[PDB]
Amino acid sequence: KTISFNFNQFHQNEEQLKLQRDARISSNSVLELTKVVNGVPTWNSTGRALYAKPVQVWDSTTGNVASFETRFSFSIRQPFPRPHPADGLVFFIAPPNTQTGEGGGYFGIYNPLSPYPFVAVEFDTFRNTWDPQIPHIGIDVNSVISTKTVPFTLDNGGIANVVIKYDASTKILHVVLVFPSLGTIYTIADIVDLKQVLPESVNVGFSAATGDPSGKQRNATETHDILSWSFSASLPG
Ligand X SMILES: *[C@@H]1O[C@H](CO)[C@@H](O[C@@H]2O[C@H](CO)[C@@H](O)[C@H](O)[C@H]2NC(C)=O)[C@H](O[C@H]2O[C@@H](C)[C@@H](O)[C@@H](O)[C@@H]2O)[C@H]1NC(C)=O
Ligand Y SMILES: *[C@@H]1O[C@H](CO)[C@@H](O[C@H]2O[C@H](CO)[C@@H](O)[C@H](O)[C@H]2NC(C)=O)[C@H](O)[C@H]1NC(C)=O
Ligand Z SMILES: *[C@@H]1O[C@H](CO)[C@@H](O[C@@H]2O[C@H](CO)[C@@H](O)[C@H](O)[C@H]2NC(C)=O)[C@H](O)[C@H]1NC(C)=O
Ligand U SMILES: *[C@@H]1O[C@H](CO)[C@@H](O[C@H]2O[C@H](CO)[C@@H](O)[C@H](O)[C@H]2NC(C)=O)[C@H](O[C@@H]2O[C@@H](C)[C@@H](O)[C@@H](O)[C@@H]2O)[C@H]1NC(C)=O
Check residue 213 for interaction with ligand Z (CB under 6 A). yes
- Between 71 and 127, CB nearer to a second copy: 71
Q: Which residues pair with 173 in a beta bridge?
A: 166, 190
Q: How many CA atoms lie within 13 A of 81 on its CB side?
A: 4
Positions in the binding site for ligand X (CB under 6 A): 44, 213
State the Cα–Cα distance between residues 49 and 56, nearest whole angstrom. 18
Of 34, 44, 98, 228, the one binding ligand Z by CB under 6 A: 44
Binds Mn ion by CB under 5 A, chosen from 22, 32, 87, 124: 124
Q: Of 179-198, which residues contact a second copy (CB under 8 A)? A: 180, 183, 185, 187, 189-191
Separation CA 135–CA 86 (nearest Å): 10
Task: Say which entry of ligand Y, a second copy, ligand X, none residue 3 contacts (CB below 5 to 8 A, set by partner kind).
Answer: none
Q: Tell me the residue number closest to ligand Z, measured at CB.
A: 44
Stretch that binds ligand Y, among 21-29, 80-88, 117-125, 151-159 (CB under 6 A): 80-88
- Strand, coil or helix: 194: helix
Identity of the residue, 213 or 236, whose beta carbon is nearer to ligand Z in the bound complex:
213
Answer yes or no whether residue 18 interacts with a second copy by CB under 8 A.
no
Q: What is the DSSP string of 109-178?
A: T--SSS----EEEEEE-S--TT--SSSEEEEEESSSS-SEEEE----TT--EEEEEEEETTTTEEEEEEE
Residue closer to ligand X by CB (options 217, 232) is: 217
Considering only 22, 124, 140, 222, the residue that binds Ca ion (CB under 5 A) is 124
88 DSSP β-pair partners: 124, 209
**CA 121 from centre of chain:** 6
Binding site for ligand U (CB under 6 A): 80, 82-83, 217, 219
- Identify which range of 70-78, 136-144, 180-188, 209-217 contacts ligand AMG by CB under 6 A: 209-217
Going from the C-alpha of 87 to that of each of 20, 42, 123, 173, 190, the distances in angstroms are 17, 12, 9, 23, 23
For residue 50, give the nearest of 77, 75, 35, 70 by alpha carbon.
Answer: 70
Is residue 210 a contact residue for ligand Z (CB under 6 A)? no
Residues that bind ligand Y (CB under 6 A): 80, 82-83, 217, 219
Residues that bind Ca ion (CB under 5 A): 105, 124, 126, 128, 131
